[PDB]
Design a protein around this ligand. Structure first.
Ligand code: CL
Ligand code: CL
Ligand code: CL
Ligand code: CL
Ligand code: CL
Ligand code: CL
Ligand code: MN
Ligand code: MN
Ligand code: MN
Ligand code: MN
Ligand code: MN
Ligand code: MN
Ligand code: NA
Ligand code: NA
Ligand code: NA
Ligand code: NA
Ligand code: NA
Ligand code: NA
Ligand code: NA
Ligand code: NA
Ligand code: NA
Length: 333
DNA sequence: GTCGG
DNA sequence: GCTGATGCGCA
DNA sequence: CCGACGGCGCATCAGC
């Protein structure tokens, strides 16, 4: 059904192998870039030559594409798939808090499976233990209807703490997706601007409230502006429990809301491409500001921004609505 | 790994 | 304490 | 051993 589905799944697999096993992050990013441009390509790829025309596809992927098209597989990937060490390493990184270095360490110590990992809980830090505890639940996606209930709860409780907070659910949700990986909330409040923090514990108060009402159930990491943890909807009387979910909360200066909401709306790929296009135009964008780079590549003063579109205009891109910042694929008959 | 020098 | 490096996470 | 590739928050360590 997915047009060029075979190719893009191959490149995604290779990407995960480079990131997770090889610890080669640039090759990860190359394979990701290549799989992104191919999936958005509206034609059937017939040869490596044709793929090579696209930006991000060079000689080695085209070569891989030629092989895949001829044989229906890739020998490199078949060998990786056979390697139990490479497989277990790859698998352990799916646990939140376990990245490529801790996975490799664990596998070399004989920790190869989910069952093994539970038995070695005392090797795990808190982040990892919570990721393990909820590993099955965090695999599941969240239907938009549950996203709306999660929204209702978050916005009710923020308003209880202080009616001047504004919470905005970003991520896939803001891009209109029918299901989401997790819930990403952007928080602002007038006391926190880029120039001053006139109130203390602005993020901590909201988090405390969300735990007090037993929405937030666990914490992975927590600072002054970013919270990362776990939440769960209330189940009704006698109906089964809802799964636990990942929730991110990011407090952003009130005067930089637009760079903020652009960042937290994503997608990640869109952001990396948008920020890459800024660089070639002579700007640098982060979640706070868009700045010009001087002759030496040092950023200068923030430019004024009164809307998301102002950011796109500075870098000569047509505005793209949030729905159009998601990745997309094409189909065949 | 791909691109821009 | 500061800084800066590594590891992990976010979009 | 051509070097850039988006950019940053939190956690933890090392060297000063
Ligand atoms: Cl690399
Ligand atoms: Cl294969
Ligand atoms: Cl894009
Ligand atoms: Cl900044
Ligand atoms: Cl997407
Ligand atoms: Cl890179
Ligand atoms: Mn489809
Ligand atoms: Mn397309
Ligand atoms: Mn998300
Ligand atoms: Mn998230
Ligand atoms: Mn303008
Ligand atoms: Mn994500
Ligand atoms: Na197909
Ligand atoms: Na190319
Ligand atoms: Na992980
Ligand atoms: Na509501
Ligand atoms: Na903490
Ligand atoms: Na659960
Ligand atoms: Na561009
Ligand atoms: Na204005
Ligand atoms: Na990066």
């Amino acid at each position: 059904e997915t047009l060029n589905g075979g190719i893009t799944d191959m490149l995604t697999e290779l990407a995960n192998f480079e990131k997770n096993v090889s610890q080669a992050i640039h090759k990860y990013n190359a394979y990701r870039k290549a799989a992104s441009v191919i999936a958005k390509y509206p034609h059937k790829i017939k040869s490596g030559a044709e793929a090579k025309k696209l930006p991000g596809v060079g000689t080695k992927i085209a070569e891989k594409i030629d092989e895949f098209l001829a044989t229906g597989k890739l020998r490199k990937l078949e060998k990786i798939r056979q390697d139990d060490t490479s497989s277990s390493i790859n698998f352990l990184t799916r646990v939140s808090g376990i990245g490529p270095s801790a996975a490799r360490k664990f596998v070399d110590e004989g920790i190869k499976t989910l069952e093994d990992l539970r038995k070695n809980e005392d090797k795990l830090n808190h982040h990892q233990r919570i990721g393990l505890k909820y590993f099955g639940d965090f695999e599941k996606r969240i239907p938009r209807e549950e996203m709306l209930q999660m929204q209702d709860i978050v916005l009710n409780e923020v308003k209880k703490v202080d009616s001047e907070y504004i919470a905005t659910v970003c991520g896939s949700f803001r891009r209109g997706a029918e299901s989401s990986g997790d819930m990403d909330v952007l928080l602002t409040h007038p006391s926190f601007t880029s120039e001053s923090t006139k109130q203390p514990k602005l993020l901590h108060q909201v988090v405390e409230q969300l735990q007090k009402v037993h929405f937030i159930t666990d914490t992975l990491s927590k600072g002054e502006t970013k919270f990362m943890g776990v939440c769960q909807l209330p189940s009704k009387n006698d109906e089964k429990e809802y799964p636990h979910r990942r929730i991110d909360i990011r407090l952003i200066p009130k005067d930089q809301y637009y760079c903020g909401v652009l960042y937290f709306t994503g997608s990640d790929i869109f952001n990396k491409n948008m920020r890459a296009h800024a660089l070639e135009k002579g700007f640098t964008i982060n979640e706070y500001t868009i700045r010009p780079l001087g002759v030496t590549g040092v950023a200068g003063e923030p430019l004024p921004v009164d809307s998301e579109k102002d950011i796109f205009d500075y870098i000569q891109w047509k505005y793209r609505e949030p729905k159009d910042r998601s990745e997309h694929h094409h189909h065949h008959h």
